[PDB]
Amino acid sequence: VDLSTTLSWKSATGEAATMLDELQPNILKAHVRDRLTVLFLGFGDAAEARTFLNGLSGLMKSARTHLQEVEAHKLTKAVGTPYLGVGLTAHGYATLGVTAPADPSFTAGAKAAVEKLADPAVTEWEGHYQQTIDAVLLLGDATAGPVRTLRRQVEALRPASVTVVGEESGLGLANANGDGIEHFGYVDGRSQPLFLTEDVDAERDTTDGVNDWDPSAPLEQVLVPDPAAPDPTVHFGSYFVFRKLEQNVRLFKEAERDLAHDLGLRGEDRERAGAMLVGRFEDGTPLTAQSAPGSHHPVGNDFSYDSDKLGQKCPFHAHIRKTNPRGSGGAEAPEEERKHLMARRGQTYGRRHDDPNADLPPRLRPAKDVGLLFMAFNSNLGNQFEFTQQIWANNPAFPFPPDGSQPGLDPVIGQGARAPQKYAPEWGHNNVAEATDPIPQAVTMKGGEYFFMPSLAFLRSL
């Protein structure tokens, strides 16, 4: 298996083909999960846990079967089957007495990452995230029905010594254009690393294109040999970040309002204040390409910041620019910068009674108990999720503006002390203004953990 480039899944042979037969879904290509049940488990007895996992492997489809289902849906509107994802924590490997993946963030666990990420202390996390977690189960589908069915089958197999220490439910949100959004109202999950050549072709043929931004990512950017598997040369897994992030929509919308007022913004153009925080409008037109919304036919991703090196269109500290400078970061060569990028597979949680894109005042938005079940696959947690959160988002110095100044923290997910930032009131011009206050932190980490999704052959071998 060649991990140095993308893979053409349809014409893969030999080991690469085997790898696909033994890989879980949702990794090389996201699985539909508009209804998602998340189950965190505790292992009371090692032998019983191994038996449980073995039975789970029986309910699991491979990456390749999933891909076929995807192709079938496009071709013939076929529905496909549910997603059963299985991850193990370092502690869960210890309970099983099995050789574990060696990523040091994985080994230490998310509770140990609290200091370097500037996370709230573990004592401030929700109760179930304070407990020792051995495993996560992901049950996902387009609709609630088959999730209920799958849950019953999982239950059937579950022994009493495998406890459920916690559960979450994901509910996908969409706008009128049919694009998925997060609670602040913005199209989310547009920009993804593409590991499959067929996905890169699709992106080229059916979106704005891939002329300016190449979304390709080598297999090594997500896949890891499964160390305890019968044959790590063909049996692969991936590291998995789960973090429950609460969104105070109310405060975020007040923040949009106050920044607009601060910058003298007027009329509908007041919406651009929000775009400055995120890097896209709600719809989400890239702020680096347009001063206003409307480019969602379809939502584009074919852009870089090479004509925006001064940040006068999209500010340096906008969320997507902080988290993917697209070669403009200034700290390392573009070819190395992009190695920190990762596959995001999150799902929103919570129910609300307001259309997230409706024209409503901030007071009518929820302030808690909705948000994002942030999820991602990494081949190297320290160099991908943690790098992005710590070295980019939380870092006041990054990315490097040509004038050598510090743009400050990512306003959407930045953690730690914040200060007022600078913005360009006039799109594409050199006028600069310093807000009267820092953007308030409207996202709160409620608890999370690190896992590894092992190969199917490993799970069967237990």
Ligand code: HEM
């Ligand atoms: C509640 C928390 C979060 C919210 C509301 C949020 C929102 C968004 C939105 C609206 C976009 C633009 C749509 C897209 O390109 O997919 C985006 C993109 C992105 N986000 Fe976040 N996000 C959150 C958490 C995170 C975290 C924790 C990370 C990493 C530590 C992250 C990394 C990224 C990356 C890498 C992109 C794509 C950037 C690009 O390639 O242009 N996000 N996010």
Ligand SMILES: [Mn+2]
């Ligand atoms: Mn807005």
